[PDB]
Symmetry: D2
Subunit: 258 residues, 4 copies
């Protein structure tokens, strides 16, 4: 928990994190599935409590390289969690409507309301990742955006939002295996685009981008967690453990009316 939490010291180095690391769990895959089922049951109960109390706002931000485990995390971690209090907001290629306003406009629109848990499948961070790597704006523009994000997230947290930002960390070789597996799976072949290859060629620039973004935006109010995502079982257990510990820390109570 404390080991994977990026301290707000601005001394973060992504090389200090191994995507194949599983040191926080002992028993291996079979034991982790059992432990995950226990955390998932607790998560279902915690969400019902969040919805009932209707005061806190929970924002889960998911960021990863293509095939890093974004969709898998949503699927497995939030499995069985009530759709009435859980919402997924995906952020893709901005439209002309979205580009006509500031980059935060489309994002701020999707923020969770009181008693709601919202998952961001990609986020406002894409405006300091893809736009940096592909040079969609000059440094003089995207460099100022780290301060914007820190301050947008401070405002959200001050106004009652609990912000959990997860970087699902995979290796270059793991991305290759997963992209090939997606291509060879007939039920997953539809997810693949030609543009995914150009992001594979820019792997190093994207790693430099994530390191810069995490170093700049992991705060006390909105912390970043580096999740070793090479082994899905560990990724699913660790994301669930961190989320459950956070929600348990809010000390939420059922309202008692008159």
């Amino acid at each position: 928990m404390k080991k994977y939490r990026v301290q707000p010291d601005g001394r973060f180095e992504l090389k200090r994190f191994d995507p194949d690391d599983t040191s926080a769990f002992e028993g291996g895959k079979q034991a982790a599935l059992e432990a995950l089922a226990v955390l998932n049951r607790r998560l279902e109960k915690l969400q019902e409590l969040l919805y009932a109390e209707g005061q806190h706002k929970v924002l889960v931000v998911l960021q990863a390289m293509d095939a890093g485990g974004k969709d898998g995390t949503i699927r497995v971690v939030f499995d069985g969690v009530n759709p009435s209090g859980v919402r997924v907001a995906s952020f893709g290629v901005p439209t002309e409507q979205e580009l006509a306003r500031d980059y935060l406009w489309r994002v701020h629109q999707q923020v969770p309301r009181k008693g709601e848990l919202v998952i961001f499948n990609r986020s406002h961070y894409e405006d300091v990742l893809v736009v940096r790597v592909k040079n969609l704006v000059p440094q003089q523009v995207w460099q100022k955006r780290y301060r914007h994000i820190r301050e947008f997230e401070r405002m959200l947290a001050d106004e009652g939002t609990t912000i959990l930002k997860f970087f699902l960390h995979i290796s270059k070789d793991e991305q290759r295996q997963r992209l090939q597996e997606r291509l060879d799976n007939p039920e997953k072949r539809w997810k693949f685009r030609m543009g995914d290859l150009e992001d594979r060629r820019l792997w190093d620039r994207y790693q430099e981008a994530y390191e810069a973004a995490i170093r700049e935006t992991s705060t006390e109010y909105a912390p970043w967690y580096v999740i070793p995502a090479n082994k899905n079982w560990y990724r699913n257990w660790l994301v669930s453990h961190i989320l459950v510990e956070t929600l348990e820390g809010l000390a939420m109570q059922y309202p008692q009316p008159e």
Copy 2:
């Protein structure tokens, strides 16, 4: 199971439906939970197909009296179904912005997009239900709304939306038990409001409102299903069966 589908003949009578009816399931609770688990697995797969194909739009409308089982249906029927392709839109007391436009404005906003399944926890029907009962607009205004709804739903269906409307039918005595159980449960005591007593006094007017709404709006394109909701196990199984049968009927295919 088509015995629960309200025919578009305008001859619908709610008295012909018993909330304690379980005749479509040959067995009880334990057998129904097993049957529901099979239907839920099929539902998970059909939504996966819906999202992937990305062509059809699925709208599930839930309407019931307070404690009728709307929250329970969402929880149990859509348990395990991917949150990326499933969305819940709740319709409560209209805001000033909402009331400043036509009653369909806030509802049309929330319609499902291609490859999305949207559940309406209460809907545009509230504008011919609570609105009628409490006379929030005169008889002259809300009577014209039946035609508006039929025509809004025709447009949605013609444009590619599969509309399933479920009326979760509970009895007056079942509501009394559930409202008391809600009050005596500390984890459910929050759902209880003082205004729930006034709505209990208006039970008969609300039943008259539902009968009128269902009779007027059950169409070939947007059918109404009366679900006997006194037994949660039966309610959950029947809603899942009707939903799975409908989605299987769309003959959805994974893109090439």
Copy 3:
């Protein structure tokens, strides 16, 4: 003046309307400008009353061929009218987010609120115009849309919206002059899109589409008005006259609080 209102008889013929017709005004450009200034002053007062009363909703729909006078009508007719109670909603090429829902979704979003006057620069009608002409959906799909529109407009009118639908009617030769004038004007060439020429080639199909749309959707609750728009002075006077007469007919009253 009731000669331009299309009766809900389904017997409408666009050939019975001459774009160069000026028979409702006993004079020319100079007298019409004076008459328009009187109507514009009345319109300014009528809008202040609409906003104050805060009950009625006013929807002005503008439809015309490219360079038919939609922007000019907004500019001249609503000149001096308070921006607090007047809004323009433009409908262009639908986005992917817009095409993912029914064609009425993006249009219903922009409907006027109580005490507001909204102008639709192009509208839901485009889904039976450019959609019909270029076969963006099959005949089996867009033919059902006349009933959808009639019923959407009935719901709006029943719920308190006053619907004025204006077809700004220009000749094929007038469009040629205006498109050329647009191209030769440096302050107006930004408006000229290359596709305008392709829409000009399809002139006859578009006239057939407008005749069909007007014949099908001109109702007692939402009437269509064919405005001879070849002479801008007449177009501006006639639209202002019809709008002022309609708003005067609402017999709006200033609220009288306790």
Copy 4:
């Protein structure tokens, strides 16, 4: 005029500003109306150019006490300006849907898009004004909001928004005259509410709230302008002048 622009030094004192001040104009009412007509013609042309170029975003924020001249400024300054590129976003009593998210959510939603000029009739500043005065949230919560505003406005400006914030400054006696004139005018009586009288009972607290807000949020990127609004002719001329000078400074060009 640079004399009315609040320097980002945090040393702003509202007592240094006289609502009856007219020192930037030497001619008087009749001469100012003529000068305003010239500026309004320039404003009409500059908006047509903003819309055509479709790159810049213009945000005009209006803040004043009740009857301070917010509606009058919109009416007179933007008179004849094309409605296609001009939008008014009013911020009133927050709805339940609005209060369920952060106070900036409803505000950020209304920001101008490329080629659009948006006027905020009241704004996000209300969340450090009526919220401060009436203690709708505790001091601990609204004190943090000045930093939020500065940073929200920095982000907007960095992303291409030209932010003009105008405080229409009226005296306590001028408000009394205007509220009475509103009450005695049959065509303006509707604008009067019983709650307007409490905002007069709390005049001093509101002045302390405006001084705090202006001192905390007047920046190089989003400046505050204190407009002596006791004389409408001067208010309309000065707001017009500042706006026209700003828009002329954008050096906007017609696309090729």
